[PDB]
Design a protein around this ligand. Structure first.
Ligand code: HEM
Ligand code: HEM
Ligand code: HEM
Ligand code: HEM
Lengths: 141, 145, 141, 145
């Protein structure tokens, strides 16, 4: 449960991401594939090579959805219904994986938003990614 | 651990640029803030009521330095983290009653602090190697439970 | 979320537990202690010996709370608020341990309810234990 | 794994009583029923729409017997699981693209199945030995990823 402070923290941090969200999207995936090689089992049809357009494009896709989620921080369940659906009934990614992408995304933001990645912002973002994870895995069963 | 000579160099060289003092205090403080339940072991430290209060607490800072110190010394025994942390493993279990999951949480926090610190320098491939190390350390510390 | 089916399944299997709940609670703890030794770090003050009265006493408490969650299956967040507060603020049990107890609870029921422990019931009990765990950990941060 | 001699005897003794054909189908069907997401690898198996559809599906049954067959062999090479499962690890990774977490879920399901089947005979400590075993197999199966 995101507090008012959290929502603020998140909106601020993401605010700064701006035009780079797509790139950060791509970079987190790349960090994910290398750090947790088991996550590659869900992308057998992609070229997982560095700077692959498939990864880049997918990075964008993920970033936009996070953007949309920040925008509807108050109504996530509703803003991500379609995506919860897709993952629960089509993709069927194992829930453990969500924590791996989340971590890689924090690492990415840390590396790129030094001044903004304060302990309190770090805490907020974590809870945020956890929340998003929960929503995306709520219709699994 | 199962570090490639190349992965070994990458760890080795970034570490050499690490101010243990600051990184240790920040890693431990971030832990107490992001995962508030870890504070159950530091009651005697004082005021952990706020990020500000945690980050400023000198007891936290000094404990952070002690922890990273020991971590630091373990990178010199990457081929036997197990024998390097055996006594520390027993202490944490038998005296401190610290759930090894805490070891994993810090590991991850540690990685965020390094990224925070080295920006550019902390590349995907450098993170992969660090991830292997934090996992390795956590595993070794949990070994005697 | 628990479907009507799930609810019937749970009330049904738990119904069979009846007056053995206490004993089954104690048994789940013991299996957990033996299989997942790290969970012992939370009970440094307990005699964990075989047939410890402390374990016995503790098993009853856990069993009583589960029984209370079954009785209020449509209002768990409220029926369990107190316990949610305790765990979040005083015990501060790492979240991962809940999954370990759940699993040892499933094992105990299986070992005692061969006839009711059907695939469908197994599934329902798993989602149920996951829900209780979610509630007890909801106020952590 | 770290199996005491007496843990190894207890595993082996009970395993002697198991009908791998039967347990095999039970474990696999149950997996597909409790964690429906695991169904993603079996779209060619047909109807898996309800519990009865899964539990009774001739293909699930036959597959389960295969998996448990391979598992039973692992039990005779408890000393070298990694070796025993190497080609199987490569296959699951490179060909099948099966996330190794699936291997731990199946392990847990299997432990419930043994409890189901053996009742009181599946003592706390027998469970503890099997927990070590299913974890070892899952680990061996993920080693080539
Ligand atoms: C941070 C949480 C996540 C978000 C917001 C997210 C969002 C998305 C989005 C926006 C898409 C594209 C939908 C479309 O094509 O219209 C997608 C697809 C996909 N996601 Fe998720 N995702 C998340 C976590 C994960 C994780 C952890 C994995 C696997 C380890 C994953 C695996 C997939 C796959 C395999 C696809 C389809 C890729 C393709 O075939 O193009 N996702 N996700
Ligand atoms: C990187 C992993 C860790 C290492 C290498 C490590 C190392 C140490 C060392 C060297 C000590 C000194 C105590 C003595 O020698 O008597 C210590 C104490 C302690 N550690 Fe760990 N530690 C680690 C992780 C943790 C974590 C994650 C926690 C809890 C969140 C924790 C809780 C404690 C506590 C409560 C003490 C006792 C401090 C005191 O006596 O006031 N440790 N640790
Ligand atoms: C869904 C699962 C759980 C339920 C229903 C549950 C319920 C309870 C209850 C009813 C109590 C007693 C509170 C009182 O004194 O009134 C308790 C205490 C406690 N629980 Fe939980 N709990 C659960 C999970 C866990 C887990 C996973 C752990 C750690 C592995 C844990 C550790 C503790 C401890 C250490 C205490 C205090 C015991 C004492 O000192 O007497 N609990 N729990
Ligand atoms: C105890 C762990 C496991 C063992 C020992 C095992 C063993 C096997 C064996 C011997 C085969 C046939 C190999 C061949 O076709 O040459 C197989 C195939 C397969 N396994 Fe695994 N398996 C295990 C767990 C799993 C799990 C948990 C899943 C998915 C949830 C899975 C998914 C598959 C699939 C999709 C196939 C191919 C089926 C086909 O013929 O189309 N396995 N496994």
């Amino acid at each position: 449960v995101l507090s008012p402070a959290d929502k603020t923290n998140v909106k601020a941090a993401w605010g700064k991401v701006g035009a780079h969200a797509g790139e950060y999207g791509a970079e987190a995936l790349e960090r994910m594939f290398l750090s947790f090689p088991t996550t590659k089992t869900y992308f057998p049809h992609f070229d997982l090579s560095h700077g692959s357009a498939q990864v880049k494009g997918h990075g964008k896709k993920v970033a936009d959805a996070l953007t949309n989620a920040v925008a509807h921080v108050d109504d996530m369940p509703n803003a991500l219904s379609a995506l919860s659906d897709l993952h629960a009934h089509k993709l069927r990614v194992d829930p453990v994986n969500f924590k791996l992408l989340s971590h890689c995304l924090l690492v990415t933001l840390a590396a790129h938003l030094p001044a903004e990645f304060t302990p309190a912002v770090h805490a907020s973002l974590d809870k945020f990614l956890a929340s998003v994870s929960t929503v995306l895995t709520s219709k699994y069963r | 651990v199962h570090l490639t000579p190349e992965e070994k160099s990458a760890v080795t060289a970034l570490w050499g640029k690490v101010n243990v003092d600051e990184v240790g205090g920040e890693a431990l403080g971030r832990l107490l803030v992001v995962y508030p339940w870890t504070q159950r072991f530091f009651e005697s430290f004082g005021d952990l009521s706020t990020p500000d209060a945690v980050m400023g607490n000198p007891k936290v800072k000094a404990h952070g330095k002690k922890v990273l110190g020991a971590f630091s010394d373990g990178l010199a025994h990457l081929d036997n983290l197990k024998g390097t942390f055996a006594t520390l493993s027993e202490l944490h279990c038998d005296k401190l009653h610290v759930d090894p999951e805490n070891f994993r949480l810090l590991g991850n926090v540690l990685v965020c602090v390094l990224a925070h610190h080295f920006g550019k320098e902390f590349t995907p491939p450098v993170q992969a190697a660090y991830q292997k190390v934090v996992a390795g350390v956590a595993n070794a510390l949990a070994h005697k439970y």
